[PDB]
Amino acid sequence: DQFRAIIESPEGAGHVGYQYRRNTGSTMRMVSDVLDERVSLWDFHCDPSGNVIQPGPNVDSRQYLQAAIDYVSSNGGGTITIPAGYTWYLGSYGVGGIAGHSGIIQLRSNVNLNIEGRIHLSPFFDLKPFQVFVGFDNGDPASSGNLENCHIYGHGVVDFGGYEFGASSQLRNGVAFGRSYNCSVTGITFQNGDVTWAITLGWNGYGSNCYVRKCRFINLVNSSVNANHSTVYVNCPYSGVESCYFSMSSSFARNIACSVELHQHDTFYRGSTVNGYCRGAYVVMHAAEAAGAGSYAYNMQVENNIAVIYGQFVILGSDVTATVSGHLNDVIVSGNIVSIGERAAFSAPFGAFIDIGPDNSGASNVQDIQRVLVTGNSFYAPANITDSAAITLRANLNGCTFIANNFDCRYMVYNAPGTTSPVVQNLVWDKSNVIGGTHANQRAGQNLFDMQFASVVNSTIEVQLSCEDLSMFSCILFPASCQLSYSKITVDSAWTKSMSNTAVFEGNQQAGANVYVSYPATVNLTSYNTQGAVPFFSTDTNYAWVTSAYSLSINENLDFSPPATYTNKANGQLVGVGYNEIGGVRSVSVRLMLQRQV
Amino acid sequence: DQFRAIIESPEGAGHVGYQYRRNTGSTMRMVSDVLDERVSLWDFHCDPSGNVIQPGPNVDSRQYLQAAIDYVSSNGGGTITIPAGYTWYLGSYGVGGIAGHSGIIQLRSNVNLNIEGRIHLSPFFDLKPFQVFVGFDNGDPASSGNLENCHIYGHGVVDFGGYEFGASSQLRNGVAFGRSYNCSVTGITFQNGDVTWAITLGWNGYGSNCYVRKCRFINLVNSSVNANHSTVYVNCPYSGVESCYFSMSSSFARNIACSVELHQHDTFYRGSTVNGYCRGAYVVMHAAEAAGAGSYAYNMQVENNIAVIYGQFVILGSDVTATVSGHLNDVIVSGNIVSIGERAAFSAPFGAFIDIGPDNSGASNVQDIQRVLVTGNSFYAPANITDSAAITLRANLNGCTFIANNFDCRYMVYNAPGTTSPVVQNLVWDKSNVIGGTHANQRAGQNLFDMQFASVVNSTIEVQLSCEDLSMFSCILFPASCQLSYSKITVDSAWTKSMSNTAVFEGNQQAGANVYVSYPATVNLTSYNTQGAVPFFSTDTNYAWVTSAYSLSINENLDFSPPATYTNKANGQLVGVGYNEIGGVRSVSVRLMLQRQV
Amino acid sequence: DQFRAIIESPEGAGHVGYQYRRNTGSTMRMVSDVLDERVSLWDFHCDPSGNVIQPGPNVDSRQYLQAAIDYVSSNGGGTITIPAGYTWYLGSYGVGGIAGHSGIIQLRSNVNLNIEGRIHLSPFFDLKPFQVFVGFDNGDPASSGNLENCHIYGHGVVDFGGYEFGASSQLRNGVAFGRSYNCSVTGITFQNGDVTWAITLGWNGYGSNCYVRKCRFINLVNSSVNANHSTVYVNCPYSGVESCYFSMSSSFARNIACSVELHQHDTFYRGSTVNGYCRGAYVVMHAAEAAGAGSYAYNMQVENNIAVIYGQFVILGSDVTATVSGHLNDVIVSGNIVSIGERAAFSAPFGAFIDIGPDNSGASNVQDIQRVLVTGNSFYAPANITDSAAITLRANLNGCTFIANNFDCRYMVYNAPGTTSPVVQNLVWDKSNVIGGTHANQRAGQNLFDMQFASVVNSTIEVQLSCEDLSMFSCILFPASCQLSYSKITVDSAWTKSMSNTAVFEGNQQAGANVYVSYPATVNLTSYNTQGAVPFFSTDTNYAWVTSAYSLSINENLDFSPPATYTNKANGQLVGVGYNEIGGVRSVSVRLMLQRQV
Ligand SMILES: CC(=O)N[C@H]1[C@H](O[C@@H]2[C@@H](O)[C@@H](O)O[C@H](CO)[C@@H]2O[C@H]2O[C@H](CO[C@@H]3O[C@@H](C)[C@H](O)[C@@H](O)[C@H]3O)[C@@H](O)[C@H](O)[C@H]2O)O[C@H](CO)[C@@H](O)[C@@H]1O
Ligand SMILES: CC(=O)N[C@H]1[C@H](O[C@@H]2[C@@H](O)[C@@H](O)O[C@H](CO)[C@@H]2O[C@H]2O[C@H](CO[C@@H]3O[C@@H](C)[C@H](O)[C@@H](O)[C@H]3O)[C@@H](O)[C@H](O)[C@H]2O)O[C@H](CO)[C@@H](O)[C@@H]1O
Ligand SMILES: CC(=O)N[C@H]1[C@H](O[C@@H]2[C@@H](O)[C@@H](O)O[C@H](CO)[C@@H]2O[C@H]2O[C@H](CO[C@@H]3O[C@@H](C)[C@H](O)[C@@H](O)[C@H]3O)[C@@H](O)[C@H](O)[C@H]2O)O[C@H](CO)[C@@H](O)[C@@H]1O
C-alpha cells in the first residue's frame, strides 16, 4: 500500500485534492494548502519526534511558542492562535536579545498573537523578575531594532501566578513592545500578579501608533516589596489607552499604583474605569526619555474616565538632565468623574484631582508646564479626608486653566506651608468652577485656597461658594512670603455675609499696582453732624488700596441712610456721601464689597 | 478495501497526516486535529443518523445550537460560529433552568457565539413571551449560578420576526446574560420586534465587566400592547454601552421606549446615536436591585451621545423598599447633543433634558439624588413644544449642578403647579448656561424658571438671557408656598429693559436673611426741592430688603440728575443723593438693578 | 487505483469523512465541508487550468479578487480573507458599472473583506484616476443599486503606490461604498498616495450606518497637481469616524488636505488624531447633496480629537442650488485639543478653530447656520502666526455659542476688512472663554475682537483678559459700517488699566436703545467750588449713552474725594456727587467703568 503510506504520512494532506465548494472556476488545491492558511500553537507544541505535547502545569510551553513566532516571522508574518480551553504555562527564560530584559517570549514583527486560551506563569518565576512578551531584540534598548505590526488580541488571559516580587529593585512586565510601531493589545485580561507594568509602549520616544483597547487589568500589585506600579506606560507618540478596566484590591496598590503614564506627544487616555489605585495618570515629559520624539510632551489628552483612587488623579511633571530640558504643554483633562475612596485622612498620598508634582529627586524648580485645560470634570472626596484638593500645586507652574468643573473636596488650591515654594504663573480659576459643600464645617483653621507659594503672577482666582462654610478661616489666603502681581482675585458675596475673613493678604499684597481684587468686609463708619447730604468715613485706615466699595447691608434706620457707595482718601479711610433727614453724628457697622480696579 | 473504509468513515480525517507548511520542526498531526481547532453550528445541525440538516423556516435549529453550546462548554469553552449566508430559525422553548425565563437558548460560561448569519424567530413565538439567549441556569435568579466569559459578536443579525406581544404582562428579551461576569455583545444587529429589552446585563447588582459595543437596535417596539421597553438594561457594576445605534419608527416607541438604563455603580453610556425613542437613559438606584453591589449607584456616566427623542433624555431616580434605601450620587452627563423631535405639544411625555422622576408608585419623597454634574450639553426643542424643559424637577432633589450647557426650549427649570411639591437642595444653575431663543414670543403666561417646589435651599440660579422674550410673565417665579433660604438668585439685565417682571417672589421670600438676590425693576422716585446735593426717595415702600440699587437708565435732563446708586430706609423706601443744578421737586421713573447682599 | 484517483482529484476532500472531536452526536461530514466554511483569495487566484498563481509585482490580482467577491455574493455572502505575508497587486481597471468611477474592484452586498496582507497598486495606475473598491453598481450613481452589509477589516494595508495625480481634474479614492447601508472599514492602514479621498461613505444622503474605526491614513497627498483632499467623506446619515489616525508630511497637504467631511445628519467625528493637514473637518449641508436624507444637516458631532493643522479645524457651511436650500443646525464641537503647527504667518490658509466659510463659488449670503455649541476645547497658535483666530466669521451666521473654551491665538473673533460683510445673529461668547497670552505684545494695530461685519444682532461678547497686552489697539472694535442692536458687549476691567482703548464703537453704536455695554475708560472731571457735598462733571460730553459709571481708581487726596459713582446729563456729561472737606474747584483724571443698561 504505497498510496496508503503517503496518505498516513505528514504529507498526506498534501495529496488530498480540494476545490472550494466544487466551484469549477476555483483553484485546484490540496487540503494541506487550506490548513496552511491558519496556524496555532498546536503546530509547534511537540516533542523531537513530532508528537503533540499536552500543555499543563508540568509542561513549559515557552520553547514551542517561540518556535511558532520564529517560523511565522520567517514567512512574512501572520497570526498564531493560542487555543481556547487550555492553559499554557511558561516556565523558563528566553534567550538572546530579550535576556537583558528578563524576557520570556520574544515578539517579532508582523506576527500577531490571538490569545483565546490562558497563559500562566509557573512557580519558576516566583520571587524573580520577568517580562513576559518582549519586542526588543537586544539587551541594550539603544541598540535594539524595531518591532512593527504586532497585535495581541482575543478573549484570553495572561495570569502572573500571584507571585510576589523577590526584591524591590526587580522589574516585571506583561508586554514590552519595545521600539514599537503599529502594535496593540486588545481584549486581553491581565491578572493576579505583583508587577511593575502590565504593558509598556515604545522606548524613550521611539515608536508610533501603539494602543491598548478593551483590556482588563486585575489585581496586579500584591506585596509591600513592590516599589512602584503603572499599569500601562506610554513611551511613544501617537499612542494611547482607550476603554480599559483597571482594578486593584491590595492595600499596597492604594499607595503605589497608577493606571497609566503618558510620556510622549499626541497620546491619550480615554473612556476607562479605574478602582483601587493610588493614581489615575502621570502626564510627564522626562528629559531622560526625549531621544526618539523630542523634549516636548504636547497634545496630551485625559478624557471621559471613571475613577475611584486614593491619591492623585492626574499628575503633571517635567524635568531636566545634564543636557536636555523636558517641557509639558497643550494638555486637556475633560469629562472625568473621579472620587477619593473611603479612607482615613492622611492614610494614603495626598488626595488631588490635579497634582503639580516635583521631579523624582524632589526638585520643584525644574518644571516647564503650561497651556493645560482642565474642564468639565467632577471630583469628590468624603468629608473626613482633610488631605483632598482640586489642585495640589507643589512645583513651579507656568500655566493651568480650570473652567466649568465641579470640585467637592477639602481644598480648592493647596500647597503645604513650609515645604516647597513654587513660582506660579498663569493659574486661571474661572468663576464657572463650582465648589461643593461636602466639607462644610470641617475647615477650622484652614483656607479654602491656601496660596503657599513663592509668587503668583498673571493668575485669576474667581471664588464662588454655593453654600455656607463658616468653619473656614478664609476663602483665600496669601502669606506675606508670596508675592502677588498682575492678577485678579475675587470673592463673590453669596454665602459670605457671616465670614470674618473672606480674602486675606498677609503682606498687604492686594495694594499692588496691577492687582485687581474684590471681596466682602465689615466696616465701621461714622458721619459728620450735618443735616442733609453728609459724609460717612471709616474708623479704620486700612483702605488706601480700595477704588470703590458698595453696601451689602440693609439700612434699619428711618432718620438717615449711609452711603450706598464709597471711595477712599489718602489716609486710608473710606468716604461716601449719605443723607441725614435729621442732623446728628451717626455710627454704623456695614458689610461692604471692597473693590480694587474692578 | 480496508483503508478505503476508514478514510470514507467519520474517522477518515483522523488518518490523513498533516504537518504545517511542511516544516520539519512542526507537529505531525492529522487533518481532523486541525479541523477540530474550530467549530460551527454545522457540526451539530444533523439528524439522529448524523446527516446534516439544512436550516430554513421549516426547521427548528434550537436543539442543535444548544447541543453545540453544551458540548463546547464540556471542553473548557471556545467559539461557535453561526455561519454566514444562512438564516437559522428558532421554533421551540428551551428546557431546564431557562424555562422560568421563557428561554430559548441557554448560554454557558466560556462559550462564545460568533454570529455571522441570521437568527430568526419562527411564528411559534407569535403572541408569546421569549428570551432568546439566557445565561441564568435556574428559574429563580437568586438560586442561579454565574455566567462568565461569554461573548456574542459578529456581523450577524437577531431578528424577532415582527411578532406583537400577546399581553402587556409578557416579557421579551434578546440576550439575558444573567449573573454575568466578563460578558459582551459586539457588532450584532437586533431588529424587527416587539420586545421589553434587547439585552440585559447582570441581575440585581450581581455581575461585572459586561459591555454592549457597536451594536444596532432597530424597530424593537411595534404595538400598543407593549407595556414598556428599554433596549439595554445594565444591572451590574463596571459595565456599559458604547458606540451603539438605536432606532425606532413606531408611534408607540415615542411614548414607551428608552434606549438604556444604568442601575449599578461604575456604569456608562457613551458615543451612541438614538432616534425615535421616548427616552435616552434612566440612571436610577432601585432599592429592590441592591443585593449584589450595594444600595448606592455612583460613578454613572452619560457622555457624547446624539439623540432625537420625544420625552426625556436622562431620568434620575432612587427609591426604597421595606428594608433598603437606594441612593444615587456622583453622576456626570456631558457632551450630549439632544433634541425633541417634531411633535405637537403634550402629544408625548413631557419633554426634558434632565427629569428628576418620582418612583414607580409615583412617590416623590423617597429620593436621595445628589452630586450630579450636567455640563457641556446642547438641547433643542421646536418652538411649538410647550412641554419642553432643561430640567423637570418632579421629586425631591439633594443636588444637581448645571455648568456650560446650551438649553434651547420652553422652560429652564419646571415642575407642574398643583402636582408634587419637591424639597430641593443644592440646585446650581451657573451663569455659563446659555438660554436659547427658539421659544421667544411663545411664553405668554409662563415663567422661564417656574419654581413650583415645597422649598429651595443652598441653591444658585444665575439667569442670563441672550435675546429678548417679552412674552414671558417672568424670568423666575417662586410661589408663596415655596420657602427659599440660603440661596443666590440673580437676573442679568441684558435683554430685560422692557420686562414688567424679571424675578417674582410671591411670598416676599427674597427678604430672607440668607437670600442673595439681584434683579431689574422699574422704580418711581421723587426728590426734595433743595438746590445742590438732594435726596431722591421711592414712592413705593416695597424695598426694605434692598441693600443697594443702581441706575440702568439714562438721564434725559440737564438741570438735575437722579442718584446713580441707592440704599434703603426702615420704611421700605429707596433713597439716594442726586444733584439739582437748579432747585425744584423732581419726579422720575428709572430702571434700577435691585441688589440684596450681592 | 480508482479510490486513489478520487482522493487525488479536486473532489478528494469530499470523500474523506470527519466528525468534530469524535463526538458521536456531531454531524458526519466530509473534510471539504469544513474547509468550505472559510474562503480566501487563494481559492480564486489561479490560472485557467486551476493551478494557483503566486502574487507579485508582475501579477495582476484584480480578476481573481473580483471572481472571489462575485462567487461569495452568489451564496448569500461571507468573508473573503486576503492572506497575510503576501502583497497582492492590482494592475487593471474593473468593468461594467464601476468603470464610470474608474473602479478597480466592485464590492458586493454581504461580502466582507478581511484584509490581513497588503494590497498595492501597480504602475499601470501612475498618473491615472482610480477608485480601488467601489460599491456602486452603475456608472450613474442615481441609477445605482445599494451596497448593504459590507465590512472591510483587518491588520492589512492598502498602498497607493506613491503615484502622483496626472491632472488636477482626476479623482482617486480607496473605498467608495456608494449608496451604502451598514458598511464599515476597521483597522486598515491606507498609505503612500496622491488621492482625493481614502474612503467615502454614502452618496448624496443615500445610505446609513457606515463607519470608519481604528484606521490609519498616512501620506495620502504628495503633489502640487492634487486639487483637493478629504480623507473620509461622510455623505450618509447615522454614520461617522472614530478612533482613527491621520498623518501627512507633504507641504501640499498643509494647503489642501482635510481629515474628514461630515455632510448629512446624525454624523460624528470623534477620538481621532490628526497631524500635518490643512483642515480638521468640514461640517456642511450642500444643497446639491440633499436627495437622500433631506436638506438639513443636524446632530453633527466633532468631539475629543487631537490635531496639529495649518489652516482651520472645523469649517461650517451651507449653500443653495436653483431648487434646494441647505441648512446646518444642532452641531456640537467639544473636548478637542488643536494647535496650528509651526509655520510663518500667512504661509497657509488663515488659521482658525472655527471658520464660517463662504460657499464653493465664494458667496457669503446663502448660509443658514445656527444652534452650534463650541465648548470645552483648547486651541493654540504660536506667537508669530498673525493669521490665527478662534473664529474666522466670513459668511452669514444665524447662531454659534462659545462656552468654556481656552483660545490662545492672535484673534478671538475675526473677519478681514474690505472682504465680505457678514450678517451676524446670535453669536454668543460667554465670559467663561479663557483668552490666552501667547500673542501678548504682538498685536500692534490689531483688535482682539475685530467685528468686520455688516451687522450684529442678538449677540453677546463678554471679554475677559487673563494677562496684559498693551500692544493691541482695542479689545473689541466695531467699524461704523457695522450695525449693532439687541446685543450685550462687556469688557472686564482686569489687566485693562493701562489700555487707551478697550471697546471701540466707530459709529457710536453703543448708544442703541437695546445695546447693553460696559467697558473701562479714562475720564477727566472738574468739580464746583462748594465745601461739603459737591458735584463733579466730565470735561468731555461724549457720555449721553451712559446709565452709570463707577471708579476704578484710588483717590490720592486727603482734602476731597471724587464721586464713587456717576450718572449722566442730557448734554453728554457725566455727573456725580463727591465731597470737599475744604472748598475749592477740583480737577482729576479717573479710570471709570462705563455702563449702559448693565
Ligand atoms: C528614564 C527611564 O529609565 N525611563 C524608563 C522607565 O523607567 C521608569 C522611570 O521613569 C520611573 O518611572 O520609575 C519606574 C520604576 O518602576 C521606571 O524605572 C525602572 O525601569 C527603568 C527601565 O528599565 C530598563 O529599561 C527597560 C527598557 C528594560 O526592559 C529593563 O530591563 C531595564 O533595563 C530602569 O532604568 C530604572 O532603573 C527602573 O527603576 O520605564 C519605561 C517603561 O519600561 C521605559 O520605557 C523608560 O525607558
Ligand atoms: C426590581 C426588579 O424586578 N428589577 C428587574 C427589572 O425589572 C424591571 C423593573 O425595574 C421595571 O423597570 O419595569 C420593567 C418592566 O418592563 C421590569 O419589570 C419586569 O421584569 C421584572 C424582571 O423579571 C423577572 O426577573 C427576570 C430576571 C426573569 O428573567 C423574568 O422571567 C422575571 O421573572 C419583573 O420582576 C417585573 O414583574 C416585570 O414588570 O428587570 C431587569 C432586567 O431584566 C432585572 O435585572 C431586574 O431584576
Ligand atoms: C455635489 C457633489 O458632487 N458632491 C459629491 C462630492 O463632491 C466633492 C464636492 O463636494 C467638492 O467637495 O470638492 C470635491 C473635489 O475633490 C468633490 O468633487 C469632485 O467629485 C465629485 C463627485 O464625483 C462624481 O461622483 C462620484 C459619485 C463618482 O464616483 C465620480 O466618478 C464622479 O462622477 C464631482 O462631481 C466633482 O465634479 C469633483 O470635483 O464628492 C462626494 C464623495 O465622493 C460625493 O459623495 C458627492 O456626491
Side-chain angles (χ1 to χ4, degrees), chain A residues 121-136:
Chain A
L121 297 187
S122 295
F124 174 82
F125 292 101
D126 197 3
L127 307 180
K128 294 189 189 167
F130 50 79
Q131 298 195 55
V132 186
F133 297 98
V134 173
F136 295 109

Side-chain angles (χ1 to χ4, degrees), chain A residues 7 324 457 546:
Chain A
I7 293 292
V324 173
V457 67
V546 174

Side-chain angles (χ1 to χ4, degrees), chain B residues 517-542:
Chain B
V517 175
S518 55
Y519 58 92
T522 297
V523 178
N524 290 314
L525 310 147
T526 297
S527 80
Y528 291 168
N529 182 53
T530 322
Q531 191 277 332
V534 64
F536 285 64
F537 300 93
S538 62
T539 299
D540 287 346
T541 56
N542 298 321

Side-chain angles (χ1 to χ4, degrees), chain C residues 439-469:
Chain C
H439 291 248
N441 303 298
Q442 306 298 329
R443 298 193 176 98
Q446 300 175 327
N447 309 306
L448 184 65
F449 291 75
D450 203 358
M451 310 295 283
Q452 297 293 329
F453 309 124
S455 63
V456 173
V457 67
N458 285 326
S459 295
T460 298
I461 310 282
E462 301 180 290
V463 180
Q464 176 69 72
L465 303 183
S466 47
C467 67
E468 193 175 66
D469 177 17

Side-chain angles (χ1 to χ4, degrees), chain B residues 98-102 131 134 136 139-141 168-171 173 176 178 196-197 199-205 226-230 233-235 261 263 282 286-289 360:
Chain B
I98 73 173
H101 305 273
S102 308
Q131 298 195 55
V134 173
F136 295 109
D140 180 19
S168 290
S169 57
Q170 288 174 343
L171 299 170
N173 198 4
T196 310
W197 317 279
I199 302 169
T200 65
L201 310 177
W203 175 72
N204 293 1
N226 200 330
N228 184 40
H229 175 98
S230 285
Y233 198 107
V234 184
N235 210 5
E261 309 200 30
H263 282 272
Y282 284 92
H286 285 314
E289 300 177 334
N360 290 347

Side-chain angles (χ1 to χ4, degrees), chain A residues 100-101 131 136 171 196-197 200 203-204 228 233 235 286 288-289:
Chain A
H101 305 273
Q131 298 195 55
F136 295 109
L171 299 170
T196 310
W197 317 279
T200 65
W203 175 72
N204 293 1
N228 184 40
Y233 198 107
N235 210 5
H286 285 314
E289 300 177 334

Side-chain angles (χ1 to χ4, degrees), chain A residues 273-493:
Chain A
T273 295
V274 176
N275 186 36
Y277 277 71
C278 188
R279 301 167 178 115
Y282 284 92
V283 179
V284 172
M285 197 59 228
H286 285 314
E289 300 177 334
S295 61
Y296 296 79
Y298 58 93
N299 277 354
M300 318 295 282
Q301 177 182 67
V302 179
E303 285 182 340
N304 296 343
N305 302 294
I306 298 169
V308 177
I309 60 179
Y310 293 86
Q312 313 87 33
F313 179 58
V314 164
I315 308 87
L316 307 182
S318 94
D319 56 48
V320 303
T321 61
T323 69
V324 173
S325 300
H327 314 269
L328 177 63
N329 40 258
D330 309 301
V331 174
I332 189 163
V333 176
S334 72
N336 304 281
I337 178 156
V338 179
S339 53
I340 305 306
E342 305 298 309
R343 65 160 174 87
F346 308 106
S347 69
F350 193 116
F353 188 79
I354 301 303
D355 182 36
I356 309 297
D359 74 5
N360 290 347
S361 90
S364 59
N365 61 348
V366 299
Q367 289 72 21
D368 186 15
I369 301 165
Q370 64 188 313
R371 305 201 296 276
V372 179
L373 176 59
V374 182
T375 189
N377 304 282
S378 189
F379 183 60
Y380 163 76
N384 68 291
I385 304 182
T386 303
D387 53 317
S388 59
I391 179 169
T392 53
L393 201 175
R394 301 190 300 125
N396 287 357
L397 178 65
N398 291 329
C400 189
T401 306
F402 293 87
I403 323 172
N405 300 285
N406 195 8
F407 292 122
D408 188 12
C409 54
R410 184 60 63 90
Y411 293 101
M412 294 304 108
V413 174
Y414 185 81
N415 185 44
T419 63
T420 59
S421 278
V423 179
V424 178
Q425 319 189 358
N426 305 295
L427 175 63
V428 173
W429 183 284
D430 191 73
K431 207 179 191 193
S432 62
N433 294 288
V434 177
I435 302 175
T438 293
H439 291 248
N441 303 298
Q442 306 298 329
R443 298 193 176 98
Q446 300 175 327
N447 309 306
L448 184 65
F449 291 75
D450 203 358
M451 310 295 283
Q452 297 293 329
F453 309 124
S455 63
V456 173
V457 67
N458 285 326
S459 295
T460 298
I461 310 282
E462 301 180 290
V463 180
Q464 176 69 72
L465 303 183
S466 47
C467 67
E468 193 175 66
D469 177 17
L470 300 181
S471 70
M472 77 178 85
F473 180 79
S474 67
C475 299
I476 183 164
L477 185 146
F478 292 86
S481 50
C482 183
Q483 283 56 246
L484 177 64
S485 69
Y486 285 91
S487 293
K488 175 186 189 187
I489 308 293
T490 64
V491 180
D492 190 81
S493 68

